[PDB]
């Protein structure tokens, strides 16, 4: 059929879109931490579910294994971070990713502009947007038990969409695909992903597997 997919277009919150341009349009040392961030949130995702999982273990009927996967892909020049923790509803996706104001955005913008490390990004409540330190597009496919599947996407530009996704079905958990920039192909090497995850994220208590090609 003429499949009728739903796509809702949105506007990043005024000061969130400032920030995104302050990341994409400014050289930063220590850019290798977009990963530690996107992995810390999966950890938090996987934590919530596990906590939910010890009163209702029907919450693992679509799911079961709490883990993380990194999937470097040299065909697409994409790096993908998949978990199978709690995931996000539409409100969750809309609110957490762009539409409503975050409390730390301003606090942080002043930090970087007076010489703070970009590693404080996680500290200031706005870790995700460090995806764009390295990523030119960024797609966050998610699924939650109460709700259905959804594909977030944004190339900045003040925009992000939230399409009700039909695509690879993924039980439960988020999937952050990154279309890396043409000088950010080092984060697609098997050696370098092992190197950063080692140095920056051995405090994660969920099996991190590398899908090496
Ligand atoms: C793209 C962001 C938001 C950054 C992200 C989110 C998740 C995820 O599934 N959640 C939902 C949830 C619920 C309670 C506590 C924490 C979280 C995070 C996973 C990965 C991921 O990158």
Crossing angle of helices 190-200 and 34-52, in 10° steps, is: 60
User: In whole angstroms, what is the distance from residue 2 CA to residue 191 CA?
Assistant: 44
Q: b/e map of 2-15 (b: 16 or more CB within 10 Å)?
A: eeeeeeeebebbee
| Cα angle 93, 81, 111; round to 5 | 70
Structure tokens given for 194: 């092992």
User: In whole angstroms, what is the distance from residue 145 CA to residue 31 CA?
Assistant: 34
Q: If we measure between CA atoms, which residue out of 81, 104, 88 comes closest to residue 196?
A: 81
Q: Is 156 helix (H, G, I), strand (E, B) or coil?
A: coil
User: In whole angstroms, what is the distance from residue 185 CA to residue 175 CA?
Assistant: 20
Q: Is 148 helix (H, G, I), strand (E, B) or coil?
A: coil
| Residue of 44, 79, 153 to test ligand 1 pocket, by largest number of atoms within 8 Å of CB | 44
83 carries a ligand binding annotation: yes
53 lines ligand 1 (CB under 6 A): no
User: In whole angstroms, what is the distance from residue 151 CA to residue 172 CA?
Assistant: 13
Ligand 1 centroid to residue 113 C-alpha, Å:
28
Ligand 1 atom nearest residue 96's Cα = 3
Residue whose pair of structure tokens reads 């439960």 in the numeric block: 172
Ligand 1 atom nearest residue 152's Cα = 1
- What does the DSSP assignment read for 90-144? HHHHHIIIIIS--SSHHHHHHHHHTT--TTHHHHTT--GGGGGGTEEEEEEEE--
Cα dihedral angle (49, 51, 53, 56), rounded to 10 degrees? -120
Structure tokens given for 124: 């200031």
| Cα angle 21, 26, 28; round to 5 | 125
Ligand 1 atom nearest residue 87's Cα = 9
- Contacts of 1-7 with C-beta under 8 Å, sequence gap 24+, read 3/166, 5/163, 5/164, 5/166, 6/163, 6/164, 7/161, 7/162, 7/163
Elucidation method = X-ray
- What does the DSSP assignment read for 30-58? -GGGHHHHHHHHHHHHHHHHHHHTTT-TT
Q: Is 145 helix (H, G, I), strand (E, B) or coil?
A: coil
Ligand 1 centroid to residue 36 C-alpha, Å:
13
80 lines ligand 1 (CB under 6 A): no
Is residue 73 within 8 A of residue 87, CB to CB? The reply is: no
The angstrom resolution of this structure is 2.8
Q: In what order do the strands lie in the sheet with 7-11?
A: 7-11, 159-163, 150-154, 135-142, 175-180, 78-83, 68-73, 208-210
96 lines ligand 1 (CB under 6 A): yes
Residue whose pair of structure tokens reads 């400014």 in the numeric block: 26
131 lines ligand 1 (CB under 6 A): no
Structure tokens given for 169: 């079905």
Query: Domains of the chain, with CATH numbers?
Result: 1-213 (3.30.565.10)
Instruction: List CB contacts of 199: < 8 A, sequence separation 6 or more.
Output: none
Measured between alpha carbons, how far apart are the two ends of the chain, in Å? 36
198 carries a ligand binding annotation: no
Bridge partners of 180, per DSSP, are 135
């Amino acid at each position: 059929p003429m499949e009728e997919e739903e796509v809702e277009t949105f506007a990043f919150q005024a000061e969130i879109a400032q920030l995104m341009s302050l990341i994409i349009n400014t050289f930063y040392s220590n850019k290798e931490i977009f990963l530690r961030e996107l992995i810390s949130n999966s950890s938090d995702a996987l934590d919530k579910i596990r906590y939910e999982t010890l009163t209702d273990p029907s919450k693992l009927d679509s799911g079961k294994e709490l883990h993380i996967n990194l999937i470097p892909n040299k065909q697409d020049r994409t790096l993908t971070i998949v978990d199978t923790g709690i995931g996000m509803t539409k409100a969750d996706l809309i609110n957490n990713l762009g539409t409503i104001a975050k409390s730390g955005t301003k606090a942080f913008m002043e930090a970087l502009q007076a010489g703070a490390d970009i590693s404080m990004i996680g500290q200031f409540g706005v870790g995700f947007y460090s995806a764009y330190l390295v990523a030119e597009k960024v797609t966050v496919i998610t699924k939650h038990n109460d709700d259905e599947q959804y594909a977030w996407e944004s190339s900045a530009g003040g925009s992000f969409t939230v399409r009700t996704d039909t695509g690879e079905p993924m039980g439960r958990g988020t999937k952050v695909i990154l279309h890396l920039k043409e000088d950010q192909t080092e984060y697609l090497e098997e050696r370098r992903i092992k190197e950063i995850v080692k140095k920056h994220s051995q405090f994660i208590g969920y099996p991190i597997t590398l899908f090496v090609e």
